[PDB]
Design a protein around this nucleic acid. Structure first.
Lengths: 51, 53
RNA sequence: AGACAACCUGGCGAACUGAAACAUCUUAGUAGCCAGAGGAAAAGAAAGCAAAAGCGAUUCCCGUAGUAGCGGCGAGCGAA
RNA sequence: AUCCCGUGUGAAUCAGCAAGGACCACCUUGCAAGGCUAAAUACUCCUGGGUGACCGAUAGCGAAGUAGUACCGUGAGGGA
RNA sequence: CAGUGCCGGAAGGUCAAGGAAGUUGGUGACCUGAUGACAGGGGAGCCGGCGACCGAAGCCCCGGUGAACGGCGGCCGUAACUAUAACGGUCCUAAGGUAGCGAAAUUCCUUGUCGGGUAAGUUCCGACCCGCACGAAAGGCGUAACGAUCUGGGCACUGUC
RNA sequence: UUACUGUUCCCUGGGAUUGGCUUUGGGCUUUUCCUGCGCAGCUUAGGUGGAAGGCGAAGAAGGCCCCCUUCCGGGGGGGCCCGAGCCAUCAGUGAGAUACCACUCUGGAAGAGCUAGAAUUCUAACCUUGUGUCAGGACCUACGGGCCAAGGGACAUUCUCAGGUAGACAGUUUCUAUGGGGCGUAGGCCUCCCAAAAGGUAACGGAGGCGUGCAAAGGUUUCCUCGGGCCGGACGGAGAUUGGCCCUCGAGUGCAAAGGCAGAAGGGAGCUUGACUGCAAGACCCACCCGUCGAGCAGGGACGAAAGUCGGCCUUAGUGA
């Protein structure tokens, strides 16, 4: 059905340097859920960008 | 939505409903105007007359 | 108690048009009609504007500004 | 936001109330629901004085002699 | 009476303003911790937003209603010579044109066939019927009288020829 | 006109003009009484508190019977009889005495209040009527004033908001191409031909597709590579699994065609998310708006021993300021 769906990091709203939600929309979920380790979040590396 | 005034009065002659010339039943605004004030069968509660009579 | 060139105040108040069509908007609260009054009328003495500094009833000209802003953020309108 | 209006509810007044562009505080200004008032200001059917790189006879007022005339229309009105 | 209209129902559903239990948000006396830079939670009150439930007609829904808007179907087979089908099977709608009339101010093909009229008549009258697309108060059929009506043939009368 | 947006007529609800009762019952109230079988037990343990005396002749325990509830274990309770007691840490039990109290929650009943709802109702304002009534110096059977009448009755009427609702009425639109117009087809992107050996190119000129799909059909590190003939082996069939010979890349590459690709871009495995963030010299196209490629750098990674490749998919459609 190819519905869009966006991914998201590990929020931790802080008083640090601009930290902030990092969505990355992607497509295709006609399945059960798919997380992925899209990275270069606010913090540099990342892992398990869910939803 | 809205209710209208329920206005205090004092009497001038016996009421076949509520009191014999003494009581202060807050009759209604649609009632003081016609039966009570045309027929002189009531007086409005003036703060002036109260503390002088 | 009738009359009036234009100017003025009030009430009612359009449309062709511009938007390259057109219903929000614009021509415009213009035109016109009615009602008053004056040589001028209306407004007017602060429940105002301002901005940590000051003003001091109204009414006009300049200028801020075709700026701020409003706007099918379109045509356009446009302060203080 | 201020500003005036139709319907219905409908405060307090100064150890108050309104405004400061929703609203809330603190501060600052002004204090409503009564009235009056000259000037600078817009105007011309007009009067007086003056001026014209304005016309001068199909121009200038439509009109340089009985010109809103003759004439035309029932009439508003048109008009040499 | 399927659709629409109208009328009568309106039991159930959707149903506006409005009313409203709550719930939420801002502001906020005072409260509290840290390097540096300021927040947070928060009485009251004042202002907001969302709102369970309630809220009529209307519509959905249910019946009557056609001199209310309107509509009135095809395909395939068989009969005593051959044919034409009295009679049957199928999808269909709400049903499938009744009586009369009919190539008709309605039939296109079309000067349709046939008869009468004419010497000869695509006009005309009477019929048949496959009514392209007639038809019952946007009435059907027929009518004596009447028509500065349209239409065909007559006798008389004539420069119409 | 069953085109769009609205207005008016009309219909309904809310508020205003708008009131007397006296009831029925919906939602808040506030005072009046039962309600309870976890098991150790004096035995159908109501939680939470004041908690050492209440309850009695304004007359109990006890038995005689009436009623109601019911898990026929017993509970509340009227009458009469009776006449000197039923009672507390007395121990059990998470929690206490049926001594007693405030109530109360487990829920249930009623006279008390708000606002409605409904019902009938009368009269004061409202609508309507009257040859009736009296007059002003005269009448007003010249409309009309006061007055009493008689009907109607807080409904209607008006005013405001809200929903529905007649093209009755208004303000407007209804595209262009089109080898005349209308009817028909067509309107954007991609590929091949016309396109005349760079690019570009027109026609209601000739052929087709697209408005996606893929967590992998992506990324890497590896390995092999199809077909279509013939020969073998049962059905097996012209064509299905299994071994040997020609081969031009005739196979495929998700979907159309063209160009491409057989150290493969063909197929299969291993791990993985680079279908990352900040970007970017220069180019190609080029009316503008758009669009396409991109060496290289930084961060942080995947794969790979390393070299290296990886910011989507063999390329061009799969998209709109």
């Amino acid at each position: 059905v190819k519905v869009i769906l966006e991914c998201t990091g590990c929020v931790r709203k802080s008083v640090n340097k601009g930290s902030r939600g990092v969505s990355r929309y992607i497509t295709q979920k006609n399945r059960h859920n798919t997380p992925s380790r899209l990275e270069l979040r606010k913090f540099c590396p990342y892992c398990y960008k869910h939803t | 939505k809205k209710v209208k005034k329920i206005r205090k009065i004092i009497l001038k002659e016996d009421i076949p409903d509520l009191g014999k010339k003494g009581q202060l039943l807050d009759v209604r605004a649609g009632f003081l105007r016609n039966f009570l004030l045309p027929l002189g069968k009531a007086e409005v509660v003036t703060p002036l007359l109260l503390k002088e009579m």
